[PDB]
Structure 1
Amino acid sequence: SPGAELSVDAAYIPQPVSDSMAAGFLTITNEGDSADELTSVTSEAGEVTVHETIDGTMKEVDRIEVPAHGQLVFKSGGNHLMFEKLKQQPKQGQSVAVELHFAHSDPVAVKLPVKAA
């Protein structure tokens, strides 16, 4: 249905070496005819920001495209989410929930288990 053509998989957090910050990975698939934008991500765990990664350096962005009949991939060595202001090191066995918010679609809740570093 309109506003629900986005789905998520490949969603996890590698256990960080930090008590305050972590990377989140996930892939967003758009089966729709129209491109969308990830415009914010929320979580009870801390603040979530979106980063593009170029040559092992990162760049924070406010908005990022999800192409029509395509994917936006967050993964090791590529773009990623960054959890900030965490209250403790997330650990294997735990999971963190986020809500993805999009310019032109309904939001999407995701569960991100913490995995080996």
Structure 2
Amino acid sequence: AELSVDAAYIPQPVSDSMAAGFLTITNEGDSADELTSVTSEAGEVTVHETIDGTMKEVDRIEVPAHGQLVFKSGGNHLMFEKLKQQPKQGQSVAVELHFAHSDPVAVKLPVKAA
């Protein structure tokens, strides 16, 4: 339970099926962990890295000991796919973050202006 999240939101996408989510995970513990999956009732969620403006899926991204994992625009991000409609300002998406070596963490991601 030494993992916590802040800086969590979704910019309003120009899409009725896909969106990027940002958040920062902080690890106050002595041992590193991995984000192993993310679940949501809104759609399917995967972790992407950004590599010269291209996106790449990654299965098990590291959250370093006494460190933080930042998901932000043009870097690492959650990718929501198979959404049913365009997420809009006023709505929030809940996800659950699952870890290799720690309990799950629920996060709320409000949809913000793009």
**What is the deviation of 1:70?**
0.4
Deviations 1:14-59 (A, max 9, x none): 0000000000000000000000000000000000000011111111
1:105 to 91, 94, 102: 102
Using the size of structure 2 for normalisation, the TM-score is 0.99
Once the two structures are overlaid, the 10-residue window that deviates more, 7-16 or 48-57, is 48-57
Q: Which runs of 5+ in 1 are unaligned?
A: none
Higher deviation after alignment, 51-60 or 30-39: 51-60
Structure 2 Cα separation of the partners of residues 29 and 12 of structure 1: 16
Runs (4+) of structure 1 exceeding 2 A deviation are none
Q: Which runs of 5+ in 2 are unaligned?
A: none
Query: Identity of counterpart residues, as a percentage?
Result: 100
SS at match of 1:33: coil
Q: Distance in 1 between matches of 2:55 and 2:82?
A: 18
Q: Secondary structure at 1:101's aligned position in 2?
A: strand
Shift of 1:100: 0.1
Across the two proteins, how many residue pairs are aligned to each other? 114
Shift of 1:111: 0.1
Distance in 1 between the 2:54 and 2:87 partners? 23
In 1, Cα distance between equivalents of 2:109 and 2:15: 17
TM-score for the superposition, normalised by structure 1: 0.96
